[PDB]
């Protein structure tokens, strides 16, 4: 059962880029659901203030990647993916920001990739608005934590 926590430091600088209307598109390191297992990564966007309807949102997508075990694994990928922006306050006062989605084997995002990262990602264009970050302690020590849990 694959779990990866993506640590995005220097977050204030990424927010400043977004405020200055400079694109911010970043990718997590690749991580495996198991060994053997699938290789995946996360893609995060800070949508620009001038974007069409999703301005000032965090977008969060998952991508399949070419992994060492791909020849031994069934395709298309099927399973459940939980994406969470972690609330970094203490346990009694904490509420993470979370979505859970089922992979859709019919989509090209979940077929076996032919290049290092599958260009089709699957996720949330409007995962979390930037202003929602200010309501709880999501940023701590200039770091956002993005957790991805994958079932089968």
């Amino acid at each position: 059962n694959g779990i990866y926590i993506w640590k995005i430091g220097n977050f204030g600088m990424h927010l400043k880029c977004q405020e200055e209307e400079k694109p911010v598109v970043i990718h997590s390191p690749g991580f495996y659901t198991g060994k053997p297992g699938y290789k995946l990564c996360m893609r995060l966007h800070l949508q620009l203030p001038t974007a069409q309807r999703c301005a000032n949102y965090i977008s969060l997508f998952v991508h399949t990647m070419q992994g060492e075990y791909d020849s031994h694994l069934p395709w298309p990928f099927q399973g459940t993916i939980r994406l969470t922006i972690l609330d970094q306050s203490e346990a009694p006062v904490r509420q993470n920001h979370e979505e859970i989605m089922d992979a859709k084997p019919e989509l090209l995002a979940f077929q076996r990739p032919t290049i290092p990262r599958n260009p089709k990602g699957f996720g949330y264009v409007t995962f979390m608005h930037l202003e929602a970050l200010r309501q709880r302690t999501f940023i701590k020590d200039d770091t956002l934590l993005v957790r991805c849990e994958v079932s089968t």
């Binding site: 989605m101 990262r117 260009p119 089709k120 996720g123």
Partner: peptide
């Protein structure tokens, strides 16, 4: 509230 497929090359 619902997930979608997006191409990282903007189409």
């Amino acid at each position: 509230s619902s997930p979608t497929e997006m191409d990282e090359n903007e189409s």
